């Protein structure tokens, strides 16, 4: 008996460092079941997609280092994916039905007995207020208002990498709780990329 801990996973911070490094373009215990607990009963022995709000193309449940803590981020993992098409002409079609069923499934998982509401990002940072992501040279900034309040269409801003069409599977989500009342308000999160990558490395350790 010795414990896993995805919230203090030094692996995450090592891979974080080197993805950052790469972005200047310009043994191991695996566990099977989980959630990053202490004891792991069954013991064996990576897309650096930069994105916010949503997780794309990953392992396919909700996890938080502390749910009582509104400041802590909620990583969400889906039992079924949702295909999202994105075009260089500047928008994203998305199945309205397929998307609506998803929110309410996440909504029952959140009730763990009260009202659940999803609202747009509180404001401030453009790469966070929008569902943003890179996609082969280009970088999309799409208003996800319609997403977080038979196709749904999302307007997109697009920048090529000048600083110094692609389809996708939606693996999961990043969420923030308004923790200040008989209502729990959830808004789209992101920013700390380490969360993207412990979303995937939850079931690993080093010893």
């Amino acid at each position, epitope marked *: 008996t010795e414990n896993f801990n995805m919230w203090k996973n030094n692996m995450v911070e090592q891979m974080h460092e080197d993805i*950052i490094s790469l972005w200047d373009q310009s043994a191991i215990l695996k566990c099977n079941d989980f959630n990053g607990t202490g004891p792991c009963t069954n013991v064996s022995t990576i897309r650096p997609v930069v994105s916010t709000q949503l997780l794309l193309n990953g392992s396919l449940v909700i996890r938080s280092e502390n749910f009582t803590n509104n400041a802590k981020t909620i990583i969400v993992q889906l039992n079924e994916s949702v295909v999202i098409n994105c075009t260089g002409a500047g928008h994203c079609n998305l199945s309205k039905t397929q998307w609506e069923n998803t929110l309410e499934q996440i909504a029952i998982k959140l009730k763990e007995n009260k009202t659940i509401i999803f609202n747009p990002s509180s*404001g*401030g*940072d453009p790469e*966070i207020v929008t569902h943003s992501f890179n996609c082969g040279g280009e*970088f999309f900034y799409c208003n996800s208002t319609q997403l977080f309040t038979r196709n749904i269409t999302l307007p997109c801003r697009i920048k090529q990498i000048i600083n110094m069409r692609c389809s996708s599977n939606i693996t999961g989500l990043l969420l923030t709780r308004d923790g200040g009342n008989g209502t729990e308000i959830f808004r789209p999160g992101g*920013g700390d*990329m380490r969360d993207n990558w412990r979303s995937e490395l939850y079931k690993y350790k080093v010893v």
Partner: antibody
Amino acid sequence: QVQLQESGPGLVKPSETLSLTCAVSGGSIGDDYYWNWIRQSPGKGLEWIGSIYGSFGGTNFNPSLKNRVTISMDTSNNQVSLKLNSVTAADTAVYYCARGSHSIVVLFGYYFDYWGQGVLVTVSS
Amino acid sequence: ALTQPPSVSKSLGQSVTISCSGTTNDIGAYNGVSWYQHHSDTAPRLLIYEVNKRPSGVSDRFSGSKSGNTASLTISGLQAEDEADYYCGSYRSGSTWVFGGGTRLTVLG
């Protein structure tokens, strides 16, 4: 590349509203930059108050000033504004206006490359 | 905030290193550390951005590094024009931005 000039009342009474303005020349505030307010009180160090992002008007605040700060942008006149409510003498300070530049914020943040000269504001009776 | 020693003294010609100690949510979460020179009656001048990059033109004497939750600025061949206040700062998770407490550099000789 861009000039900034702060201005506003030099004296404010306690509990009243401090109001300042930055006039930006040489570029447009509707562009892809953060426009920041920063201050320094005599003896103390720098303190970020908040930012507004040109593209859509979204704001960020210092968590300990949030309850009494607003920031706006005037796209004609090309100006950014600070309103700080319910002041006290602890709000006496030099107020700076600064532009925030960035590559990808989620990996590299942003940084303050152009600053105005600052305007002194004194809270007193 | 982020912690720096309040004051350091060196001499003309020497090197100095100013440490900024931050947290897992600023310096350890981003390569977003910036350093600022501040002379009296002048606005703060950007020195280092994105841990180690420089604008033109701040000399080669200035350089920034990062280690875990701690960043550093080093100044070589101290000239008299370097007697200033020095500030480190960083973007921080939850869309906030935070400055260090400041280091007041004295240059002897």
